[PDB]
Write a protein that binds this ligand. Structure first.
Ligand code: NA
Ligand code: NA
Lengths: 280, 279
């Protein structure tokens, strides 16, 4: 099965939706050559004990999601920003690895080292715990009956699983120190930030990963909840998902201005990055 | 505003019970506290709220603690120190929540919560429990008369329950209760909040039904029944059935978790209902 017939039309409709509902176009956070080299050197050091050597061009493709999905207008701590770059990137490499090579004994101390370098004492613990929780969860749900249950029952159960599994809770808990904004920090720490953004991130990620994921027997994709071969059923399901994104976006506008800027920059930025050629 | 669910009180109570009898089956049981343990719990609660100038009777503390005695899962308890912590944290947060918010002194109260966590938990768990407590009371203070609360609570059941994962206190509950069980799977679900996300609807629908009359008379909007017109029998019946269907879907999904975790989750939801109806 495949969403290839719908690829152009769904891309057009996603963009049209963001143009109408978010308006502010994503922009890319600027890293200096020195900052990017520091980010990459930390990524390399974190994954070396795992015997992984990764090219700059691969790291640069992983990091693009942070550069595009964060909110440059509101950045206050670039040390935190670099931490998110590193943590995102090394987590991508970890997720791309044969799980039989997952050595948590080697990896978790590296994640702690990154958090301690870039964050102050309390924020380091918060970011590390979120990272630890994410990678631990992933290891638990590999072929869990729970994963099967939540991902096949209904969109609501599926997105409930994905708040953690897509990594958005981790993302918010390592990102709030970038902004140093008290309200955002609380929504990140209660996970309301993650609960508000999960659908907009997951629906876009799922659409564009569907052909690959079903080909690999992966069940964490909301489009597996419809018959994509039936154009009628697909369109109906796709419209229902667009409607979910729009409901979330309109609710997000009730948050304070900076928080809403960050949430909408994340959802729209992730879309632009996902569809980018820099990422093909 | 002047509305009420009194006409449905008996029938809905009967249908909640029938639903739990069919879908959970295992009846709630109460955790036993010795006299000494209850005295220790009550002494810690009184100490925690003394800086706020609050005097609370033993009978009041015992009424609050009943939710912990009924909603935890006695077969699987391993750490009664953690269990005492949950009794104290639950009770003192009930008192804080019952106070006129103009008397909320965080500078006095937060250190008392930390004191409690440090006494009963190990280093790491004390921090996890304290953060969850801190986040919970900080959220409550944030969402008073906030546009966000209005939006989430009036938009759809989905947006409302998304807000209540934190606001009803279940994420806090899970993050202070996992040490009671020392069960690695449960500890992770509590830490990722999947535990809270799974149990939010069953706890919230029950609490909201039995608090509706009081909450609408106080202009509080955090109640899912405000999303339907409780004066229209037909609309109410329809909405009540959809909420039962929501509880059932969650319960059936919860049975995919490992046995101990599912026992804990289902004991929480069913035990909360028993305590709510006896209260
Ligand atoms: Na951006
Ligand atoms: Na019980």
């Amino acid at each position: 099965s495949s969403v290839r017939p719908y690829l152009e039309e769904c891309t057009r409709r996603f963009q049209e939706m963001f143009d109408r509902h978010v308006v502010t176009r994503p922009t890319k956070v600027e890293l200096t050559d020195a900052e990017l080299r520091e980010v990459i050197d930390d990524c390399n050091a974190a994954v070396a004990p795992l015997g992984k050597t990764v090219s700059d061009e691969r790291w640069i493709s992983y990091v693009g999601v942070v550069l595009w999905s964060q909110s440059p207008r509101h950045i206050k701590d670039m040390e935190a920003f670099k931490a998110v770059c590193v943590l995102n990137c090394v987590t991508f490499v970890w997720d791309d690895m044969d799980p039989a090579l997952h050595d948590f004994g080697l990896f978790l101390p590296q994640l702690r080292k990154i958090c301690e370098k870039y964050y102050g004492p309390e924020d380091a613990e918060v970011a590390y715990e979120a990272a630890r929780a994410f990678v631990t969860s992933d290891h638990m749900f590999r072929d869990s009956p729970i994963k099967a249950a939540l991902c096949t029952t209904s969109p609501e159960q599926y997105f409930r699983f994905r708040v953690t599994d897509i990594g958005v809770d981790f993302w918010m808990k390592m990102s709030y120190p970038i902004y140093r904004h008290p309200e955002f920090t609380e929504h990140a720490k209660t996970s309301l930030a993650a609960r508000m953004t999960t659908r907009g991130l997951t629906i876009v990620n799922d659409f564009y990963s569907y052909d690959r994921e079903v080909s690999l027997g992966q069940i964490t994709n909301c489009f597996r909840l419809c018959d994509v071969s039936d154009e009628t059923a697909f369109k109906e399901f796709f419209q229902a998902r667009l409607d979910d994104m729009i409901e979330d976006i309109e609710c997000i506008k009730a948050f304070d201005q900076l928080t809403q800027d960050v949430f909408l920059d994340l959802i729209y930025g992730n879309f632009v990055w996902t569809t980018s050629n820099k990422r093909y």
